[PDB]
Amino acid sequence: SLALSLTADQMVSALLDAEPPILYSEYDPTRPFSEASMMGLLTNLADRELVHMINWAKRVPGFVDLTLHDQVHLLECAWLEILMIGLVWRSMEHPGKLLFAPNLLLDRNQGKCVEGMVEIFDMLLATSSRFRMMNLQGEEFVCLKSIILLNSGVYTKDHIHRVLDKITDTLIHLMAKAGLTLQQQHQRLAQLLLILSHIRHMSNKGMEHLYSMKCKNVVPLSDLLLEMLDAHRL
């Protein structure tokens, strides 16, 4: 595994370059959203984002060394977490708003267009506010997103933990660079990793919601998105 011999800077450089593009919504008609309209935009965007996520995962150090089955498992488990932490990160400089896409900036009230969506919107906005108050750096974001990918499905393996430890060293190296004390380093590390618990929680709430829109047949889902959804069995 070439991921273990990578320096901290080589780890940061690898993750930054691996960053997926910011896609645009299939919407550029402005036409006040109904329930089927908003769900359509989100799933359509996610279906296109998923493709770039696979490319990104393959460029995450240590992920190419995994079995194809193991790669599928980690993605099937954390794809919604990875989408949401990306959403939360893009919405960081937009208080009270969620940047699903550059041409799709939603607030809380537009969350009321879809039932049960409002509770998910508030949680996402709460995480975005938290990232902003913590002044999350891009170098830290690409680490946390990589951590989610390798960690979320690892208890469902020694190599993966070796890479996870390697990313932890990277996070510490970044904070030490920023001029934080030893105490501030492990504190901030703890603060960041505890946010992953809520990112997980938001995903679980999002899965049941996406499944609820499936059974109600509000919006037709792509087979890919339908396969990622079936990997949780609800």
Binding site: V51, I54, N55, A57, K58, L68, L75, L224, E227
Partner: peptide, 11 residues
């Protein structure tokens, strides 16, 4: 038959 299978090994 998995769409995720194809996407991963095609890139």
């Amino acid at each position: 038959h998995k769409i995720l299978h194809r996407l991963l090994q095609d890139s």
